[PDB]
Design a protein around this ligand. Sequence first.
Ligand SMILES: [Mg+2]
Ligand SMILES: [Mg+2]
Ligand SMILES: [Mg+2]
Ligand SMILES: [Mg+2]
Ligand SMILES: [Mg+2]
Ligand SMILES: [Mg+2]
Ligand SMILES: [Mg+2]
Ligand SMILES: [Mg+2]
Ligand SMILES: [Mg+2]
Ligand SMILES: [Mg+2]
Ligand SMILES: [Mg+2]
Ligand SMILES: [Mg+2]
Ligand SMILES: [Mg+2]
Ligand SMILES: [O]
Ligand SMILES: [O]
Ligand SMILES: [O]
Lengths: 87, 46
Amino acid sequence: IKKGDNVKVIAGKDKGKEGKVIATLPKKDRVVVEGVNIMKKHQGGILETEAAIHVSNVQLLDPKTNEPTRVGYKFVRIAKKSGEEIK
Amino acid sequence: RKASTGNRRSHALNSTKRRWNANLQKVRILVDGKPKKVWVSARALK
RNA sequence: GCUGUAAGUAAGCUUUGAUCCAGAGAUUUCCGAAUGGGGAAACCCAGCAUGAGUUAUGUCAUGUUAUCGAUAUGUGAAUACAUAGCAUAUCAGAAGGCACACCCGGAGAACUGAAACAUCUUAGUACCCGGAGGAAGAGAAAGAAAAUUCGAUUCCCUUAGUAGCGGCGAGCGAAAUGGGAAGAGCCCAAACCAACAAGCUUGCUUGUUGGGGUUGUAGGACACUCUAUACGGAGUUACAAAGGACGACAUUAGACGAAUCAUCUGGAAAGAUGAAUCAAAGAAGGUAAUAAUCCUGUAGUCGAAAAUGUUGUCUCUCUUGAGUGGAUCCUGAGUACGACGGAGCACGUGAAAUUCCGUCGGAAUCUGGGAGGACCAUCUCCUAAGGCUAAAUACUCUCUAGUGACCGAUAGUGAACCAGUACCGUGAGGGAAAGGUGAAAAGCACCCCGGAAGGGGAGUGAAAUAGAACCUGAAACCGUGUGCUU
RNA sequence: AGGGUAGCGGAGAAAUUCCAAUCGAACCUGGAGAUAGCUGGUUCUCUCCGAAAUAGCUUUAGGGCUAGCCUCAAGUGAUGA
RNA sequence: GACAAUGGUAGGAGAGCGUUCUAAGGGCGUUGAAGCAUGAUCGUAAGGACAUGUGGAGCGCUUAGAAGUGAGAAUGCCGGUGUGAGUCGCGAAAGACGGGUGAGAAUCCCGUCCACCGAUUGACUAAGGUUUCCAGAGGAAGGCUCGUCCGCUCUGGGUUAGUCGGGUCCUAAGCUGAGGCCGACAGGCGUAGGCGAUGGAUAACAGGUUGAUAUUCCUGUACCACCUAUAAUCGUUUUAAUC
RNA sequence: UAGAUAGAAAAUAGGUGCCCGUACCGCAAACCGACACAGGUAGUCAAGAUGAGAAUUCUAAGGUGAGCGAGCGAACUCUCG
RNA sequence: AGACUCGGUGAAAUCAUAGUACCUGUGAAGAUGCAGGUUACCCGCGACAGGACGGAAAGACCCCGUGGAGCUUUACUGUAG
Ligand SMILES: [Mg+2]
Ligand SMILES: [Mg+2]
Ligand SMILES: [Mg+2]
Ligand SMILES: [Mg+2]
Ligand SMILES: [Mg+2]
Ligand SMILES: [Mg+2]
Ligand SMILES: [Mg+2]
Ligand SMILES: [Mg+2]
Ligand SMILES: [Mg+2]
Ligand SMILES: [Mg+2]
Ligand SMILES: [Mg+2]
Ligand SMILES: [Mg+2]
Ligand SMILES: [Mg+2]
Ligand SMILES: [O]
Ligand SMILES: [O]
Ligand SMILES: [O]
């Protein structure tokens, strides 16, 4: 439900980090974001592409802090905890 | 009607088993109220 | 975001709202009841009409073409009459399929028990056939019973393994009174009238509609008195007659849906440690390890353009309802009953009622007839010989939502996986074995030997003695070496 | 080569021979987990007691029933040896 | 503290252990569960703890309840592994040499010689099987050995008809069989007609050609039916040409 | 012949001509026989010398060398003289 | 030709554990496994075949079963016709 906005990945390899997302993959439920870099290899010794994680993620717009995203009233449109700006 | 009718048991004088018919009476006639023919009983032809 | 499982590549689509979800509609090749003919199922061959293309034939497109019956026609003649038949047209008719379930009916067994067996039981089971339903059957007293009588049927309990049947052995087995679930009662036939009909005896009677009328404490007819009036009404489309309008509710896609931060360990926390929060929501599952406060979610609330289903009120239809008197008539005929052989009633021919079957004989008409377990009498009760009937009940091929002191891969469906498969058999038919990498494919770049396979190294990863015949990896079995010994 | 007859049956120059490698009555499914007085098999320890192989009857003698002979819990109460 | 008993099958009575699950309570667990393995340990027994290694996520304990509750033996079912055994066999048969290939050849290709069948181990078709056919690669298993090869795998590719066998022609045996006769239902019989060839009738030959097709392709030469176009014969639509 | 129907077409030119099957083995390695199995598997052609002859012996046509072999040359079994 | 040695490939019915003598005796009354004596260094290979009451086949003979089928008859009871 996300198309390249901000997040804070909290509960994975290394946390406290943020970044912006690529394909959400609705079926596998796995998003692509800067924060994991597999050492893939083809015939280079390594490749350093970008890999995915399950949704252990959260958004942050006004508080500059993770909150439970909360799609609220119809004006649909997002309406977060403390502040209500677009997703 | 033309049916083996009443198919049940037949006891002997000491009551062994045996199946029978009681094949109901029917004799054929030029019917006296319609010019065709068909099996017909006697009990009706009184 | 998408182009299934099923990777991958390339081409492309998509806020001008894809894909996806739900409802309606359109298509829906061929075989198959198969239905124009034929046929070794999925092929072949035709016919007629119309219409494509040819100069023309060959060739094609669509439509149509079976049987049976049941209606309307004509036509029919072996014989003149005119029927049998014959050609044509109409029908949303039927045929078939199935859920091996539940129901009714036709037919209908044996092993077995009996300590053997023929009566018997198993059993009126199985399978077979047929029919219909979503439930069926039954059914509104020619009962049950013996009193302060009740007044369709069915099912559950109980009476009762009692009373009884029985080579009186095996064994079989009610019913009633009573307590409960559900509760519903109605139309014909007949005697009477009108109409039309052949015999018109110019006598009226039979043939067909409409009325008329439906019963035991007798009733109707017929005669008489009032109600109603084309309706005051009851109507009740689930029986009782068969048609149609218009609101509410549920179902088939969905949405909202309260709440947490940090330290240590870790590859990774959802754990320990602390301090905090929501609760109509601490059900559940997933999330790199065990989470009410990360996601899906739940409590609760909202929501349907269209379609369906059930319910409601006006339309809608359709309808007279009682009473007395009983002079005269009517109350279901080759029926009921008897005998003869049989079956079934818990009941084996027994004293054997009551009910059904076949042959044969053969009653009565309300001062009548049947039952009350042989049969007669008195008493009591009921009125066949015509028909319909919801619910209570039995089952679940299937769907929705749920559950388990149920199984967790030799268990459980035979079947967790590409199974009624491979396979076996001519054929009916019988029938297998086989789950798991890791959190994520990050699925071993690169060097080396090697023809390859395979391997040693280097690296991905916490771990590759997790490296695809990939979690864990026992015992048998096989080896390599070695302390002691021969 | 194409066809027929099908098991309570058929066909048989007849032997109880053939009927999809089987025939003193084929084959598959269902009744059906048929029946068996017969054989075979019956899963974890200890403690206490402890037999019989006889009588009778048995279309019975390798089975059964009753009495004997055992065990357990009550009762009797010195009756037993 | 004394006294006495304590072999034991069928079998009777009694007390007991552990497994799976449930309920409740209280506890353990990445600072490594369960299981597994090792061990010189506890208990009278069935059995249970402990330490260590491997293992990588759930488990114990007390009280009680319900059980598909225990397996050495069924000529038991299934699975795996041996024993026999590197033992019998390797499915009639005459091969040898050279040259190539290849990582590697008694077995593969090439040739020369030799031997064998020859009313045939030859050539052609039917039934039958279903792509085995041909080319190019490959050798994991199959081949009763080896294999650089195959009828095995992988990729690709191959079957041509107016005259041929057959259908649009016929029919027996037999099968089906409108109406119809019979039967408890099912269904059974059977006329009309219809299907059904191994038979009857039926218009074609020779050569060439591909790694793989041949009366099918081309090359030449022929035939039957049919339509269209054209004219030398007909003359009531009779009869005559004519169907 | 009943019947159709005005009234042909000699030989000429031109064209039209459907479905199935067709590969391969087919006394075999490919069919039935569970096997790349010493079995069966209808039919057609079937040459040469010798011979009555499709017999027999040896060869054409053409096809094959049989899917384990090398040693030694004992028992024993089998096949032949 | 097989067998036998070398190379290649590589089964089976069977199988309580085994480091598996003989005699005379005992014994379920015919012993590798017991008692008493006797002789015999460990391990092979090729041959024979007395024993392993050897294997294969829940004994085809005999008997039992209140087992079963087929068949006969002036056995019973019934029956189609
Ligand atoms: Mg219909
Ligand atoms: Mg009688
Ligand atoms: Mg009668
Ligand atoms: Mg397992
Ligand atoms: Mg014979
Ligand atoms: Mg049994
Ligand atoms: Mg006793
Ligand atoms: Mg075992
Ligand atoms: Mg050479
Ligand atoms: Mg063919
Ligand atoms: Mg052969
Ligand atoms: Mg000759
Ligand atoms: Mg050897
Ligand atoms: O059985
Ligand atoms: O059984
Ligand atoms: O049995």
